[PDB]
């Protein structure tokens, strides 16, 4: 079954990481990745790179364990595996520097940060992020979490079973580009966005030269990446910004939806001054995003994530 640090200590290895730099409970269930669950108190299990991990923390350390299945002997994560975890959590960025900057320009942020410490922005795989945000509206974390689980159960490789939980890899393009994908996703309860999952997979595979197209957007400017993503069925401005932020290494991206508007009004008394519109629209949404980029700086999307963790 699922491991705990206490039950099987020799299968865990550690990364130095103060709780000031990372709070798993404030990050993993906060609406960035949908692949994690707290199966044991303070222990988060999920898929990171088509492998199952469990993570837990002590005061100065992130402890990690990886499940290898029947082909390999059980052993602690290797140094390269642990680096993969560090990259996922972007641990080379000093969060304290960012928090100090954001609090210096934003008193509301500084207030919220006192309770919501160690909220980091994950660095997600581009396929996984794209298709997670295509497959469901992101109106409720519980809904999207369920839809993503169904998608991976449907078209993702079976990795391992732990207790009553069967973990799947994220689906491949080829899997998602099949005939019958839409219909089978609608049969599982995904509804009209099932069509976008299929069509976007086929678009990337057939028309854009495959996975490399999407991977190249990590190196491309925010402007090029956003525009490129918007060509895909099911991706408009907000999803494209989500992907840019969360998987294409554009920390400046600030996705704008009704949730962000609510925070802007509730916590900032913000009103648009460019647009004629009083409410969400393409022009006013752009304005809002540029507002927070201008306020918070080049890591504005990371600052947004702190406020989203606090709002849950």
Author numbering: 12 to 323
Which passages does the manuscript contain on this structure?
Here, a series of new methods are presented based on the use of a low X-ray-background film as a crystallization support and a photoablation laser that enable the automation of major operations required for the preparation of crystals for X-ray diffraction experiments. In this approach, the controlled removal of the mother liquor before crystal mounting simplifies the cryocooling process, in many cases eliminating the use of cryoprotectant agents, while crystal-soaking experiments are performed through diffusion, precluding the need for repeated sample-recovery and transfer operations. We have previously shown that the transfer of crystals to X-ray data-collection pins can be automated through the so-called CrystalDirect approach, which relies on the use of a thin, low X-ray-background film as a crystallization support from which crystals are recovered by excising the film with a laser beam and attaching it to an X-ray data-collection pin. The CrystalDirect system enables the automation of sample mounting and cryocooling and can contribute to closing the automation gap that currently exists between crystallization and X-ray data collection.
Some of these crystals grew in conditions that require the addition of cryoprotectants when processed by standard manual methods. However, in all cases tested the automated laser mounting and direct cryocooling after liquid removal with the CrystalDirect robot produced samples with very good diffraction properties leading to high-quality structural models.
